[PDB]
Structures are given as C-alpha cells and as structure tokens.
Curated annotation (Swiss-Prot):
Function, in words: Transcription factor which plays a key role in the Hippo signaling pathway, a pathway involved in organ size control and tumor suppression by restricting proliferation and promoting apoptosis. The core of this pathway is composed of a kinase cascade wherein MST1/MST2, in complex with its regulatory protein SAV1, phosphorylates and activates LATS1/2 in complex with its regulatory protein MOB1, which in turn phosphorylates and inactivates YAP1 oncoprotein and WWTR1/TAZ.
Protein name (record): Transcriptional enhancer factor TEF-4
Full-protein residues shown: 220 to 446 of 447
Domain of life: Eukaryota
GO biological process: cellular response to retinoic acid; embryonic heart tube morphogenesis; embryonic organ development; hippo signaling; lateral mesoderm development; neural tube closure; notochord development; paraxial mesoderm development
Source organism of the structure: Homo sapiens
Localization terms from the record: Nucleus
Amino acid sequence: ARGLGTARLQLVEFSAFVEPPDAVDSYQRHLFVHISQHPPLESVDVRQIYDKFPEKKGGLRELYDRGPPHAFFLVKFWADLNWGGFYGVSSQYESLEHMTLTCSSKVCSFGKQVVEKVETERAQLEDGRFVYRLLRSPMCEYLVNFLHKLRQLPERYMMNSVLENFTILQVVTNRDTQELLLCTAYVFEVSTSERGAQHHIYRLVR
Ligand SMILES: CCOC(=O)c1cnn2c(=O)cc(-c3ccc(C(F)(F)F)cc3)[nH]c12
C-alpha cells in the first residue's frame, strides 16, 4: 500500500474547512485538515492505538480481527486551528468496480463514542472509473462547537492535551455485500501557528 486506499477503493480527497461569510465578496476557505491524493507507507502496530479507540462493539480491535488488514489505515492529523461562516466537510473516493458505499464516521471522546454519522453514496461513472463524491457536507454541530471551544484555549499544549482524547473512526462498507472496504482511524494534534494542516498516513499492521 502506497496511499490511503486499497485495491478496491481509493480515497482521493478529504477536507474539513470553514468559508468566512465574506467569501461571497472574495472567495477564501480555511482548511482545518486536508488529504489530497489527486515507496510503501510506514506501518504502525495496531496495539499502540487500541486504547484511543474503545473495544466497545464493532470497534477498531473487532473490525481489524475480521479484516482484511490491508484495508486498515491510521491517519495522524496536525490540524490548523488558526483562523465563522460555513463549516463543511468534503470527501471523494474512487474505484474501478460499480458499488454503492455506506460511509460511517464515529467521533469518540476519551475512547467513548460521542456521535456517529452515516451516509450512502452511489457511483458516478467518469472516465472508465467510478467516483463517489460527498462535497460541502455541513460539518456536524458537535465538532463546529468543539473547534470554537478548542480555539479559545490559551496554550497550544492544552489543545494537544484535549485532542489526545479525541479520535474519529471511519468505516466504508460495500452497501450491497456488507463487506468492509476501508477503515481509517484518525488521531489529532494542533499544528503550530505558521504551519498549515499536515498529515501522515500509516498502514495498520499486527
Ligand atoms: C476525519 C474523517 O472525518 C470524517 O469522515 C467526517 C465526517 N463528517 N465529519 C464532520 O462532520 C466533521 C469532521 C471533522 C471536523 C473537525 C476536525 C478537526 F479539525 F477538529 F480535526 C476533523 C474532522 N469530520 C467528519
């Protein structure tokens, strides 16, 4: 694996952003986190992140046991919290086979599920490949609220302390055959002021 994606499904873009209200006058947007995928990746042993994701039911541990392991990834984000209009999230996946996807996103706090978002995306055949777009989806209110509180902290190390207990688990399944296609675990730190968002993608091995 050389990127976030498998033989059956590749992540092309993900971004979490805000467009200030004056973007209508002159467009701009702030990216909190961003992955653009328009030598193999480093690996991380899954035991090292087991605590950040509750055992619970159908958690990282359970899903990873069912497999296949080449479908499991860890993304480390350095979020850019240096920026009040539209808060949005955009995702795009690609595949060679025609499928209907169910994308489940679970937000955890202190290894306890807080909110869950589930959506179904159908394929658009474009240039011999199938594309799945969910663009400009409104960011869930819990995380818009979280970002506002998070930016109020006076110290970067306090934001990292808070973000230590904050994880997202994203599961993409083939809706018709129910087989898992992709599972990404996301962990978070805050980027320093001058640096924008950054990420590091790893394969989850055990
Ligand atoms: C990481 C993968 O996320 C998703 O797949 C997804 C789906 N709905 N969704 C939101 O409705 C808000 C965020 C988000 C909001 C804020 C931040 C952060 F800036 F705090 F890091 C990160 C993700 N993320 C998501």
